[PDB]
Amino acid sequence: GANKTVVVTTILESPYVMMKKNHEMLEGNERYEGYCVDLAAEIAKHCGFKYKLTIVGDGKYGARDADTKIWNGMVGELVYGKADIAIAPLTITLVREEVIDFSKPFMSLGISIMIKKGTPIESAEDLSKQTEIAYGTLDSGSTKEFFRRSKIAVFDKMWTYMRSAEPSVFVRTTAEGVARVRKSKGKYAYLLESTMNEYIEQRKPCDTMKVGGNLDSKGYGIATPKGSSLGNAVNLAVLKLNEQGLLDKLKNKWWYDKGECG
Template identity: 35%
Template sequence: MSTKEKDDSLVVDNGSYQYHMLFDNHTRLIVTIFDEPFMMLKKIPNDTLTERNIPRGTILDPSRVEGFCVDLAYAVCHDRLKLPYKFLIETKYGKEVEKGVWDGMIGALVNREADLAIASLTINGEREKAVDFSKPFIDLGISIMISKPEKQKPGVFSFMDPLSKQIWMWVIVSYLFVSGILFLISRFSSYEWYFENEWDLIPRNKFSLHNALFFSFAAFMHQGVDLLPRSISGRVVTSAWWFFSLILVSSYTANLAAFLTVEKLVPPIATVEELAKQTDILYGTLKGGSTMAFFNKSTLTTFKIMWNFMQQHKDDVFVSSNSEGIEKVRGSKGKFAFLLESTLNEYVNERAPCDTMRIGENIDSKGYGIATPLGSDLREALNIAVLQLTENEFLERLKQRWYYERSQCTNSGSKDSKQTTPLNLANVAGMFYVLIIGLGSAMVIAFIEFLFKAKLDSKRLNQNIREVMRRNLRISITGIDFDEKLHKEEYLPLKQQQLVTSSPPSSRNIHRNERTPTIANKFNLTKINNDKDDIFRGHKLNHVFHV
């Protein structure tokens, strides 16, 4: 028979489910279990009631408890289903004792002692045969917990840490490739060839191979140089390289401060595969739990290896409770890893003394669901309610509230929780794409310039365009075609050089010493300048003429 205490919020249950419904014909009983942060007893001053001394079968008013599942029950039963409810406390999740006989929360539903179960109750195949589950209200999986390793101080070459080795390699390749493209374009473009003065026999090109390498390096280091390309194609290459350098250097600088000031945590293992391959670190699970059953039944090679390893060390790795496993991790100094559900792993990592951490991704995928007896009239309504709460992100806000807003490691662990990681190729792939597009565009423009120059030369010299292109290509590779230029009288530098060398020394001295030219000399200079303009058809700037 049920007895009601002086406090209306607490009822000790010794009777049947039918009696509870007589007690309040419209009240639904929600069976649950104390499990932080899902279901916790509210702390009231001068109250001697604790979670440990509350017996199984106790009925609690919602005002006496708090937690993730308490807020979820209020949102589902009160806000959407408009049902009054109370909580029925159980001490076990439930397993099949014998054929068709269950204990714990599953047993309460099978025996119709409760209307629904809202707790950290995992959905699995065996339980689905005994009760109905709603859609998962929280997703989880098996995860790995280890103790936090000691922090490592920055090393001598920590300045290279902001970028991964892959990016450093591609930056060097890009630097050499850009320098080579700039050198080739400057050779093919007629705008990069020039005569430094009127008497030069050989045209000059500033972008030799070593100058191209120096220019690219100086641009990457944001240093100014006297070398600047004149052709459109050369300027396109330079612009793309400047953009690439700006983004890369800015990203590197932004990440460098964090690497030099934050002491990094380097765990001994990073994935479940690494854990399975080594033997120095022991690992185990909760004895008789769903995690242990998962490894026992798994057919994957990695999990088989892990299960065999745990069987060999079963006296040291299997624990009787999650709290025992967590304490074992804290006292092992990195020599024990505990396999547990990710929800508990995340929550413990946010609680003092903040000395544990989660590594790797979840090993499997499952979820917590709201359970009801088979054929319950609440099943469809509960499914709709859970879907609506998922869509409006109410469940995500609940997790944020009970996991992270109440974190005890916010100040001490904020830096640890936000570990700086090197930028990889995926983070900065865009600037490489821009550089590749710029180099490709520059090569196309350089080819168009080459064709355009060949067409102009073929018209001016009245020659076949293929011959002109062949000659210009030879000139671009070797410099100047002397054999051809020596036979052309209108080639100004050779003509002037021949005039100077053929004149007697006395006349050359006279010309060198005279400051004021005569009328004849002025006429000759004017004629020479006119001839020069006809030949070069270019601009004269500071005594520098383009070919």
Template identity: 25%
Template sequence: MATVFSRAALFLVAAASFVTAERVIRFGADPYVSDLRNRTLRVVTKAANGFVLISDVDKDGNNVTGNDRFRGFCMDLLSWMSTELGFKYEYYEVQDGQFGIYNSTSEKWNGMIGDVLYGKADMTMAPLFITSERQTAGEFTLPYYDNGMTFAMKKTASRTSNTWGFISPFQGELWAAILLTALAVGLFQGVANLATKDIDNEPQGDAQEDKDEDKETGFWEAVWQPFVALVQLGPEFLPRSSSGRLSAFFWGVGILVAISTYTANLAAFLTVRNVDNSITSAEDLVGQKEISYGTVRTYATWVSFKTSTTEPYQSLGVVMKAKEETVLVDNLQEGLDKMRQGKYALFADSAELDYHASRQPCDIQTIGRVFWQTGYGIFLPKNSKYTSEFNKVIVTAKERGVFDALDAKWIKSQECSGTDQSVLESSVIGLQDMLGVFVLVYGGMALAVIVLIGEFIHTCAQDVKKSDAHPKTLAGAAKTRLKGMFSRRNSKERSTRNNPDSNISHWP
């Protein structure tokens, strides 16, 4: 009599602990001995991402058999339960690959539910949704994983009006690098222009000087040219020196790549539309025709939609029934593929959808609140003497944080953390993406510097070969030329200031 009371008390305590999540009050001091101890249970299961993974080889590529073929949340949980209750178990995969739905025509259950009801298995161990229909056929333990229904859609980029949106295709650091590179190229071309001009063969007379002013380009005009080329206005002059032309060529290649990339990315930004922007709940799907929606035809979700008498689920079920051939899918993967093609919402277990939404390629998202919340449970035959045993150990697992640890190990993932800023942010071009272009431009400038040094030496050598009024050594010629690089420009600016009638404009 004491034993019966002890068992009943433990069951009630377990149930109370699950509902209220408060402390467990234990009655009596007699140790409780499980009816499962030393028993071997035949357990039916079904592959489900994260919860049940079935493979004939292990992670090292070795062939495995028996229980070693099965891994996942459910397997770790049952292993822990067996240690607590002292039983053994043997897994097998359900033959028809179904969770279990009642066929009103044949009046039979299929899948794992059928295997348990017809004596092939002692229990299930898989992410099996607790429903009232299944509960009438057999019985479930307390939920070992809180779950419900929700729907998911392809993640789309949201775009809002932005006055400065035209700069969005490139990151700020890339814009800064482009402008600084344009300045660097301009400064180099300005120096190259001054270093290689023939400062000795100056035309005589103010008239000739004014005539040639338009033909020669000053330092600041040369600096300005890369910025003009950047917006494709066309060059106002072409560098005279080989080094200047070489740097202009590599800068032109860089501009070509940058503008092509910017144009393509800007077009993508401007054509993005968040067509699903108004879909924030299941209610929003009712009445609209742009987005179709469905579920897996063999899931309990479909049965629930067909039998629901509450809105909006009844209306959603009516629409799914009318379009059954096009909106229902045969398995979850087919539904995910259909969803990724766009304009399709998939209803399924929230845990399954969350699993896929939190993993690469991070292109889907669950939407709205979770509804029809019950959870996953272990299914057993009606009036099973093991139900209370499992209820007790499920409560114990909750108290010890077993489920949280397994959830973190098998279900939750950080792969997609930080991607909720929208898909657009991932398509913004950064400096790292264009690094090769800058390597090309600056590599070309380095080559142009070598050419410029050669040109300068060659020009100085020509100065030495001239009349006696010129330097007699290469070093002297180089010194004279370096001193005179800016002298002519300065003298022309003074001449212009002294001649207010001059029509010649100069860069400041």
């Protein structure tokens, strides 16, 4: 049939997608800015479709409830046919790959440790061997799931620690984890994806830092419903954008050109 506007599901997560200050004076896609807004425009240009950015109803990335078997977040929007594509910092995982399609990575990343500057921690092993400095993750998402599923000895011990720590070491949002780091006088470390750690490191008041190597290696992908006809074009678009250096340009723009820490 006739072409339709492609419904893009995304999430408000700086610097990937933010509402512009002057959003009330703008309409539609122009209300938003960020790395994923720019990426969505580049993909659309290359694939020759028109699209509407929509924010995921429940503010979640995507996980399957263990009892009800229902997928939430952006994954759920794709699975249940509420959106045609997800363009977001959405991690390619095994469990998600089984239910939706993903492009090859548009960004490479790993779980990493955020500390308040001066915190005497250099590695995950360091965290795992102590409890003076509390540490946690988002209360949902691929980072939490990594620890929950991990059989690697250090990570398995960290998960048992995080699951049992009081008060709770889990945070509802990246902003909440960052503010907890900044407010805890070195007694909370935050486990989050390296690209987000890197972004925060260039934000005022420049009091956090990424420490140690990454715990794992993975990527974000553009996601579509399994079998979607859009999947192919979009994947080739990501590959072309990467090869042309445009993804590297988008990262520099949102991380470093706009950096507040010198």
